[PDB]
Amino acid sequence: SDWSGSVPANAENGKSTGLILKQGDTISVVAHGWVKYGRDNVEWAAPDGPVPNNPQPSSIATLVAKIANKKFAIGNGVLHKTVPVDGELILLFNDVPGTFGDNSGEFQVEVIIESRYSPLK
Amino acid sequence: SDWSGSVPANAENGKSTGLILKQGDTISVVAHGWVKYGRDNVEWAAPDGPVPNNPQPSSIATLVAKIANKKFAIGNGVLHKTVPVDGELILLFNDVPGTFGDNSGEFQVEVIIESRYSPLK
Amino acid sequence: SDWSGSVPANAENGKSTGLILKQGDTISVVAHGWVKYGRDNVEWAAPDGPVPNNPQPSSIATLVAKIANKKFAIGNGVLHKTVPVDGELILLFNDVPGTFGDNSGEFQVEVIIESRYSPLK
Amino acid sequence: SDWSGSVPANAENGKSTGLILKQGDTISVVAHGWVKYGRDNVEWAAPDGPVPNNPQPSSIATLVAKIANKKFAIGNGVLHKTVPVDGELILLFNDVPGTFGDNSGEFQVEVIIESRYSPLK
Numbered sequence: 001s002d003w004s005g006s007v008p009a010n011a012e013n014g015k016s017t018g019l020i021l022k023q024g025d026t027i028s029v030v031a032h033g034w035v036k037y038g039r040d041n042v043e044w045a046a047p048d049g050p051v052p053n054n055p056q057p058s059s060i061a062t063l064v065a066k067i068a069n070k071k072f073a074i075g076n077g078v079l080h081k082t083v084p085v086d087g088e089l090i091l092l093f094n095d096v097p098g099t100f101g102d103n104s105g106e107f108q109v110e111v112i113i114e115s116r117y118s119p120l121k
Numbered sequence: 122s123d124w125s126g127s128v129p130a131n132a133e134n135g136k137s138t139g140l141i142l143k144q145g146d147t148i149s150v151v152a153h154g155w156v157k158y159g160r161d162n163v164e165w166a167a168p169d170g171p172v173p174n175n176p177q178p179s180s181i182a183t184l185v186a187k188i189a190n191k192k193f194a195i196g197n198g199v200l201h202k203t204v205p206v207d208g209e210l211i212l213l214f215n216d217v218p219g220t221f222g223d224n225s226g227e228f229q230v231e232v233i234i235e236s237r238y239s240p241l242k
Numbered sequence: 243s244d245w246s247g248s249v250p251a252n253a254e255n256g257k258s259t260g261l262i263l264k265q266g267d268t269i270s271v272v273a274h275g276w277v278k279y280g281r282d283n284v285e286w287a288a289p290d291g292p293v294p295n296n297p298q299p300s301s302i303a304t305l306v307a308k309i310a311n312k313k314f315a316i317g318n319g320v321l322h323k324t325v326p327v328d329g330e331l332i333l334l335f336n337d338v339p340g341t342f343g344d345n346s347g348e349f350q351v352e353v354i355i356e357s358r359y360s361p362l363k
Numbered sequence: 364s365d366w367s368g369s370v371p372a373n374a375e376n377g378k379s380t381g382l383i384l385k386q387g388d389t390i391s392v393v394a395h396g397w398v399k400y401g402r403d404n405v406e407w408a409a410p411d412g413p414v415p416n417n418p419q420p421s422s423i424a425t426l427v428a429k430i431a432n433k434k435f436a437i438g439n440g441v442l443h444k445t446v447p448v449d450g451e452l453i454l455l456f457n458d459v460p461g462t463f464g465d466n467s468g469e470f471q472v473e474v475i476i477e478s479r480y481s482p483l484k
């Protein structure tokens with residue numbers, strides 16, 4: 001993969017990948033593992049989000065991509081998706097701001113840059 | 122995607138994709154969603170497997186690929202993996218045989234054939 | 243390949259690949275072989291164009307892609323290029339209109355649809 | 364691209380790309396341009412080989428890939444081909460040994476490592 005690493009659930013600023021994406025690039029992502037978004041026995045989340053026996057608001061406690069401070073859904077993974085903005089790829093466990101203190105665990109994530117933007121001319 | 126569809130947790134024989142894979146092909150898979158592998162409130166599973174607060178034996182209640190009656194790990198997804206055997210791709214919720222009766226729900230899965238085998242000559 | 247076939251040099255309307263493309267798709271192409279754009283011994287062309295010892299105007303007697311009646315350079319090939327317009331992919335030996343009658347031969351061309359447009363959201 | 368650069372026709376040892384390939388990787392290549400394999404006005408070659416109005420023996424004056432001192436056809440390009448041996452990718456204008464002194468020009472070549480070997484398990 002172009003980047004592989006952990007995404008800690010307690011990282012409020014996310015995990016920086018160092019991948020500098022440009023508008024028009026395409027990427028794929030797969031995310032593995034489990035994290036806690038709280039201390040309770042039920043407050044587990046996959047990258048796709050909280051276990052549905054304790055659901056949270058939309059996009060909360062899911063794996064998202066942050067690019068130029070805009071957030072995009074990733075969850076368990078995405079295949080060959082076009083990047084609409086420039087910026088470094090930050091992978092973020094999208095917990096409510098200020099509530100990362102009771103989080104633990106990390107996802108294992110792989111990112112592939114499938115293509116760099118170049119149009120037909 | 123080359124194939125997108127549901128993989129029911131209660132399907133003991135899995136979900137046939139119709140994709141005929143050859144040794145040397147490469148594929149990518151991403152799987153989303155939640156299933157129950159039992160009627161208890163804790164018996165939830167992501168494609169990666171059971172929620173860790175109620176763990177099961179290795180590979181049980183995970184999403185796997187069946188090709189020529191061999192099983193391969195898939196879970197939440199894989200990127201650009203080489204197919205080692207010829208056969209139709211079957212996607213299977215790998216519950217213990219005979220225990221699919223209390224399963225429910227389905228994963229949403231996407232499969233892409235990234236390349237068909239062709240060697241440098 | 244998603245499409246493989248011969249592109250005749252004397253086909254003033256090009257060769258249909260049957261591939262229906264959408265803006266934002268990415269494609270790769272490789273083209274092999276040799277054609278004649280005239281009866282003279284010097285009037286050979288690779289997909290990239292005429293041999294430089296008998297140059298023709300820009301883009302003339304080169305392999306191009308025709309989509310929605312717009313022309314894009316292909317030549318010997320392109321890798322993971324973004325498609326800017328919807329339409330059927332036509333491959334065309336871009337000879338001067340009305341001068342296809344003295345052409346002969348065909349390029350062997352392979353086309354791969356690397357991805358179908360799907361943005362991060 | 365993973366590597367893009369020039370392949371001089373007069374480089375008897377070829378052009379080292381620095382790409383370290385492993386058995387099972389897949390690669391794509393496209394090659395553009397024209398070179399001379401001799402001082403005569405007719406001794407032009409595309410990556411696919413000599414212009415057919417002055418043909419040479421089979422495989423001579425064609426663009427090939429050298430991996431572990433073995434030669435593989437490339438010509439104008441290849442798409443998603445599996446690498447059969449470990450080694451650095453060397454791109455070579457395959458002229459007769461000792462006859463590179465009368466060559467000039469260079470091909471413009473792009474190489475993409477489409478995937479790094481990882482099997483389903």
Ligand SMILES: CO[C@H]1O[C@H](CO)[C@H](O)[C@H](O)[C@H]1O
Nearest residue numbers: 037038056060095096099102
């Ligand atoms: C409802 O509380 C739980 O979920 C929220 C997010 O909605 C926070 O993560 C909090 O730490 C956790 O205990």
Ligand SMILES: CO[C@H]1O[C@H](CO)[C@H](O)[C@H](O)[C@H]1O
Nearest residue numbers: 158159177181216217220223
């Ligand atoms: C421990 O029981 C639970 O898990 C097993 C597999 O380990 C079966 O799926 C069963 O249906 C479910 O109730």
Ligand SMILES: CO[C@H]1O[C@H](CO)[C@H](O)[C@H](O)[C@H]1O
Nearest residue numbers: 279280298302337338341344
């Ligand atoms: C100089 O003429 C040559 O090139 C032109 C295109 O410019 C036509 O293909 C013509 O048939 C061919 O003989």
Ligand SMILES: CO[C@H]1O[C@H](CO)[C@H](O)[C@H](O)[C@H]1O
Nearest residue numbers: 400401419423458459462465
């Ligand atoms: C027949 O001569 C020509 O072709 C051979 C290879 O076949 C050599 O490249 C030589 O330099 C060139 O002049």
Ligand SMILES: [Ca+2]
Nearest residue numbers: 037038099100
């Ligand atoms: Ca929290």
Ligand SMILES: [Ca+2]
Nearest residue numbers: 158159220221
């Ligand atoms: Ca069960």
Ligand SMILES: [Ca+2]
Nearest residue numbers: 279280341342
């Ligand atoms: Ca002509």
Ligand SMILES: [Ca+2]
Nearest residue numbers: 400401462463
């Ligand atoms: Ca020579």
